[PDB]
Amino acid sequence: TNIQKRFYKGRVALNVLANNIENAKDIFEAAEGYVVVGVLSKDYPTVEEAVTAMKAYGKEIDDAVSIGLGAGDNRQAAVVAEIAKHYSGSHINQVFPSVGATRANLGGKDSWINSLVSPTGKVGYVNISTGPISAAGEEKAIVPIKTAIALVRDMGGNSLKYFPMKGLAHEEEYRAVAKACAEEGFALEPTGGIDKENFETILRIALEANVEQVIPHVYSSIIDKETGNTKTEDVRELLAVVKKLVDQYA
Amino acid sequence: NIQKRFYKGRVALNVLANNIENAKDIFEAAEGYVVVGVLSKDYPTVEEAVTAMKAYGKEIDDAVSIGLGAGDNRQAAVVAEIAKHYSGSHINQVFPSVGATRANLGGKDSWINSLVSPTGKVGYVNISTGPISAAGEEKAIVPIKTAIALVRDMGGNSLKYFPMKGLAHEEEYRAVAKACAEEGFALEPTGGIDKENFETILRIALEANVEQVIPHVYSSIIDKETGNTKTEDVRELLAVVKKLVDQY
Ligand SMILES: [Cl-]
Ligand SMILES: [Cl-]
Ligand SMILES: [Cl-]
Ligand code: NA
Ligand code: NA
């Protein structure tokens, strides 16, 4: 239930980063609450300090916090799993092999956990070897999308975080991932190189494929280079695209 | 803690117990070089399994192997929960539940295996061994070493290679043993192992130089009338273990 509040008409929630709590509140207002706001484990020197900060953000934005690795950094996977013992947020970014530990560490508390799987250059197949040791291996586990989804479900995850997309560089692969998610009744979180000019196309592919729940991640493309703040005018623009598309695909 | 159970650091038996008395007799017959299986599915709830398993453990130096029950993947969630309360010495788990089980140990020391399966494709294992993944019409079929790396990322200690159907998948098993030896990872051959093929199955793993091997021997050594695992059979298996380990 908890992240469910964040989906516009039950279909699409935004995931964007915040610079600080004041930027997080401004983002949450700009998105009319249809957002989870990323706070990165790597921005704090200890688990305790991350938990304190994340709780403080959550107090302000209805716990609509997305616990981040930081650009999918697998060096933070164990830290994120540990944070989950102490704070659930609404949404957790995790690498594929760490999903099970993260779900277990929630101790039955409600949260939504994504699973990072990657493009392969082979339509229909994703790379699930996205943990520290698995990413260093001489061969990767390159598997059919639906087999990855079933494993994620068994591990306690709620969606595929499909990363790094490089915008539309892997469009044919992405369309196959969206179709597989729709077949499996599973959620999809497209991430990497999404900007204001490609956001509509990327979201439309998922909705056209009848993916039920989509969480697009939009990071540096909407961050002011000078202040480090995520731009609220940009969040408002993204929300307007979300409403336009979701209303169409209703 | 399981390290005490490996004969000369190389081989521990895994066999089932009918009851605590049979567990005690097995532990004596194997001279402690065994972890004794107690099945989660024999108890209706996690709490009842934990209570039972703790009592077995008090009698046999906590040399308990927590079981799914012939790899019943419906028990994966149960075994992951049991691990919050009791570690035993050894835990049987399906591939996608290894991480949850390690996390649930909360830092307690225990050894967790990962069930992966033959595929008919030498060099490749089926990792889709949880309830939802095994229900899929296709499986995730991956190179052995890729499965090992994933199990390591999840906090597992070995591959449980099941169901072997004895030596029906011998070529595939030889490749698994070679890969485990090359990567310094442990191996637990299971399924259809009996007194007749035990030596060959164990020899393959030791010849390949797998460092730690836990062969599982279940119904083939159980008295059909009483249900007790036979101590004379456990003694016979241990004799094979010592003969082979002394050699390799
Ligand atoms: Cl990217
Ligand atoms: Cl089992
Ligand atoms: Cl078998
Ligand atoms: Na992240
Ligand atoms: Na090497």
Side-chain angles (χ1 to χ4, degrees), chain A residues 1-47 49-58 60-108 110-171 173-182 184-207 209-224 227-232 234-236 238-250, chain B residues 1-27 29-46 48-58 60-195 197-206 208-223 226-248:
Chain A
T1 264
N2 313 135
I3 192 170
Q4 297 293 142
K5 303 177 204 169
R6 313 275 69 102
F7 288 95
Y8 178 72
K9 300 188 152 36
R11 307 293 306 275
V12 176
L14 299 169
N15 185 313
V16 306
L17 307 180
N19 192 33
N20 51 30
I21 291 180
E22 54 264 42
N23 188 37
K25 294 170 61 63
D26 205 2
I27 294 165
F28 194 71
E29 194 274 355
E32 307 173 3
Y34 296 118
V35 62
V36 287
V37 179
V39 183
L40 302 189
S41 60
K42 63 167 55 174
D43 281 348
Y44 304 94
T46 61
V47 163
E49 288 166 285
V51 171
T52 297
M54 292 168 184
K55 285 175 175 181
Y57 278 82
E60 297 300 321
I61 57 168
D62 193 37
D63 286 309
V65 171
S66 173
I67 303 175
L69 300 157
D73 185 2
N74 71 44
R75 299 172 299 164
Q76 294 295 307
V79 175
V80 169
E82 183 59 23
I83 287 170
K85 293 184 174 171
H86 313 290
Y87 183 63
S88 67
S90 291
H91 171 99
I92 302 177
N93 296 275
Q94 191 49 285
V95 301
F96 177 96
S98 289
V99 170
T102 305
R103 174 61 62 194
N105 283 347
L106 288 172
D110 185 1
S111 196
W112 167 290
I113 304 164
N114 72 33
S115 178
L116 201 161
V117 304
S118 299
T120 58
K122 181 183 186 185
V123 175
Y125 291 80
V126 294
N127 166 22
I128 62 173
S129 295
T130 55
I133 297 305
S134 52
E138 298 205 30
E139 291 192 288
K140 304 306 176 57
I142 310 299
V143 302
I145 303 146
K146 291 187 284 297
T147 74
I149 289 169
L151 282 162
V152 176
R153 288 192 181 284
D154 275 336
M155 292 176 183
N158 299 272
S159 70
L160 296 183
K161 180 173 188 180
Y162 189 57
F163 175 82
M165 281 180 64
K166 296 173 208 292
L168 285 164
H170 294 276
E171 184 178 343
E173 285 180 70
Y174 170 59
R175 195 175 318 247
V177 170
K179 286 186 191 161
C181 285
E184 292 284 330
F186 204 57
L188 181 58
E189 312 196 18
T191 310
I194 303 177
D195 60 37
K196 284 186 294 180
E197 293 184 20
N198 64 23
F199 177 84
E200 184 172 329
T201 295
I202 292 171
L203 182 57
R204 191 183 294 277
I205 289 166
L207 298 173
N210 299 116
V211 179
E212 187 61 19
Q213 300 199 301
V214 188
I215 305 179
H217 287 52
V218 189
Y219 296 162
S220 63
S221 60
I222 63 170
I223 293 171
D224 184 292
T227 66
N229 294 322
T230 292
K231 292 182 281 189
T232 58
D234 287 3
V235 174
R236 283 187 284 276
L238 295 175
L239 182 67
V241 174
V242 167
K243 295 198 186 179
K244 181 178 75 180
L245 293 185
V246 168
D247 291 348
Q248 173 180 170
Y249 290 99
Chain B
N1 216 54
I2 197 171
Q3 296 293 328
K4 286 175 281 170
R5 317 270 67 109
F6 291 91
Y7 176 75
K8 296 184 170 180
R10 304 299 300 278
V11 178
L13 295 168
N14 187 311
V15 305
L16 306 179
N18 193 31
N19 48 54
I20 290 176
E21 189 69 13
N22 191 38
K24 294 189 325 187
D25 290 342
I26 289 161
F27 190 69
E31 303 168 8
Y33 300 114
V34 61
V35 288
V36 180
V38 181
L39 307 184
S40 62
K41 64 183 305 178
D42 285 339
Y43 302 96
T45 66
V46 169
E48 286 165 283
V50 166
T51 294
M53 289 169 182
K54 285 169 167 176
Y56 275 90
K58 181 159 183 187
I60 59 165
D61 194 34
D62 288 302
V64 172
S65 173
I66 304 176
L68 299 160
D72 183 354
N73 67 35
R74 294 168 301 176
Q75 297 292 303
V78 178
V79 168
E81 291 305 317
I82 289 168
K84 295 182 178 170
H85 313 290
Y86 184 66
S87 69
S89 290
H90 171 97
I91 304 174
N92 292 280
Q93 194 45 286
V94 304
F95 178 96
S97 284
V98 171
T101 301
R102 175 64 63 192
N104 283 167
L105 288 170
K108 299 187 297 286
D109 185 11
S110 196
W111 171 289
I112 305 165
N113 70 33
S114 175
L115 203 167
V116 304
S117 298
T119 59
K121 195 182 188 191
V122 180
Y124 293 76
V125 299
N126 166 15
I127 61 170
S128 298
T129 57
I132 301 164
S133 54
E137 292 186 54
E138 303 299 337
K139 308 302 173 70
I141 301 310
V142 303
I144 300 145
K145 294 182 184 187
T146 76
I148 294 177
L150 284 163
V151 174
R152 283 176 160 148
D153 275 337
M154 292 193 288
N157 297 270
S158 70
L159 300 183
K160 180 170 185 181
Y161 191 55
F162 174 82
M164 281 184 61
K165 295 176 175 63
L167 283 161
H169 290 97
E170 184 177 333
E171 192 182 346
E172 278 181 78
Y173 173 57
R174 289 176 175 277
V176 175
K178 182 171 185 282
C180 284
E182 286 169 351
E183 297 319 313
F185 207 59
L187 180 60
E188 316 193 18
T190 309
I193 306 181
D194 64 24
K195 290 181 289 177
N197 62 27
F198 180 86
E199 186 172 326
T200 295
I201 291 168
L202 184 55
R203 187 187 296 282
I204 285 164
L206 296 173
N209 206 32
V210 180
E211 188 61 24
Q212 301 198 299
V213 187
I214 304 178
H216 287 53
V217 188
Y218 295 165
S219 69
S220 59
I221 61 168
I222 294 176
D223 182 305
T226 67
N228 290 312
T229 292
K230 294 180 272 180
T231 54
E232 62 270 32
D233 288 4
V234 171
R235 293 180 73 178
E236 187 174 319
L237 299 174
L238 182 69
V240 177
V241 172
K242 296 194 185 185
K243 182 183 69 168
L244 290 183
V245 171
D246 293 349
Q247 162 170 200
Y248 291 102

